[PDB]
């Protein structure tokens with residue numbers, strides 16, 4: 001609204017703070033550069049003039065309540081990107097308004113970190129896989145406690161600080177609160193991480209679609225490549241049958257009950273130990289088998305995933321990041337996270353850090 005020039009170009013905007021009271025404040029940012037394009041809009045990078053901290057501004061068009069804003073405003077979690085401020089500007093289309101979302105700036109993503117190891121034909125050390133997965137499940141347990149389904153869980157949406165090993169879930173644009181009765185669109189997630197019940201056209205799906213997507217990211221981090229690389233919507237199901245086998249009539253009823261059960265070419269389930277490279281940690285395979293499951297209700301909950309034996313290293317008091325630093329926050333659990341499965345609190349929070357209530 002007010003482009004000044006002190007350093008070279010300072011934009012000063014009355015941006016409402018996201019988390020907290022609707023006390024509109026004046027916020028100055030500089031170093032404005034484009035860091036992403038698309039149909040959603042544009043994402044800029046910037047540096048706040050007051051604090052000097054780095055931020056990312058996501059600019060989208062709005063008309064007449066925006067779901068992404070209402071969700072970003074309600075969420076506050078260490079493993080979720082924070083909506084620092086939001087404000088309404090103009091731009092690429094005159095006569096139209098633009099919602100700007102000022103968010104935490106994170107330098108890297110799980111996708112880019114994994115692509116580095118994949119290009120070198122090397123596998124990501126499991127301590128990274130444990131850390132990134134555990135944090136993703138905490139962010140999933142938090143948002144699911146409010147009934148919010150992310151519906152776009154992919155490695156490109158797992159912001160990452162490679163020095164602190166902190167993971168931030170981002171891109172809540174496709175997210176939605178799921179209520180028991182109301183139907184929801186079935187063509188939603190990113191294909192590589194789409195749940196089978198979504199391919200089967202289920203409109204009564206639950207948050208289990210996110211846990212499936214996470215299992216696809218666990219397998220992708222253990223394999224070096226996507227486990228279900230579907231050419232299209234029909235291939236995607238074919239890719240799942242190559243590993244999980246043909247779904248059982250019961251399973252097809254759990255995925256989409258409205259779906260007319262048919263006699264499918266019964267393919268056998270390829271054993272899980274053979275899908276992964278030799279000497280892949282057995283607990284990593286055991287968890288993936290409990291997340292990539294046809295029956296949505298049989299998939300683990302995000303808190304149950306966190307309590308799996310695969311993550312026991314993260315609960316070792318002597319655990320440290322390989323760069324020397326100590327691990328990021330892993331047991332700063334809030335009652336809301338632990339709301340479902342309360343007794344896991346004494347399992348998730350190890351003895352060496354029971355001060356977390």
Ligand SMILES: O=C(O)c1ccc2c(c1)nc(Nc1cccc(Cl)c1)c1ccncc12
Pocket residue numbers: 035036037038043055056058081103104105106107159170171172173
């Ligand atoms: O959508 C959010 O919630 C959201 C929230 C934060 C970031 C973001 C998207 N996208 C980023 N980068 C990015 C990289 C490539 C393409 C595009 Cl479109 C965006 C990014 C970078 C650094 N810090 C925070 C973010």
Ligand SMILES: [Y+3]
Pocket residue numbers: 152171173174
């Ligand atoms: Y999206």
Ligand SMILES: [Y+3]
Pocket residue numbers: 229230231235
């Ligand atoms: Y194919």
